[PDB]
């Protein structure tokens, strides 16, 4: 899944 700070 996407990193904690992505998007």
């Amino acid at each position, epitope marked *: *899944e*996407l*990193d*904690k*700070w*992505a998007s």
Partner: antibody
Amino acid sequence: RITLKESGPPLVKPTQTLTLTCSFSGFSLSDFGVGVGWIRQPPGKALEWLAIIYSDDDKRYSPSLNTRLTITKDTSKNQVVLVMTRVSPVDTATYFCAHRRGPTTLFGVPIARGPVNAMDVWGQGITVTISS
Amino acid sequence: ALQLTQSPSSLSASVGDRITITCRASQGVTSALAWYRQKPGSPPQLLIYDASSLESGVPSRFSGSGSGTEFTLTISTLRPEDFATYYCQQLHFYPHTFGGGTRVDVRR
């Protein structure tokens, strides 16, 4: 100045449980967005990401070692613990813990996430050998 | 998981030379990429973060560029302490995978 140091058993036998501790200073696990991760390196091989925990207690694990790993933090003692169950000879390696910056804030407001894209400070690492 | 391939896997060089190491991702990782230098017997050391930002305290010799699936680390004027192993790390997706590394040794 930020510093981290890994501690634990230099030798552990197969099937046993390995508990590694990361003691740090210079930052708190109550600081916004900060993380502490664990990376291993078998002798002569490449770095392998294991897990990470953040100040808000969010935790993430390597999908390959997920069932054998548990990461926890003790905010008050400035420590993070990684427990690896059922170790085997292949888990022999140098284990490093490292700090991850949280987003930069201005008067409390996050204004930059660029600093989170790296593990900026690493411990010296602790060598663990798994053999009966 | 996301695959990071460094190239070359090994590189020979001489003090004073300019070298470039590449890291390619199997999927785009935006700018969430870091470069580290690991001297023998020591832990990795952060050189570049967020693909191109120079980490405080790191000599200006090091610079990083690229985004998406293509990244490069370049050392202008290689120094003796630069003979080591370099790794790239991706932090856009979990797990935060590392490249296989690129060994830089003395050419002869």
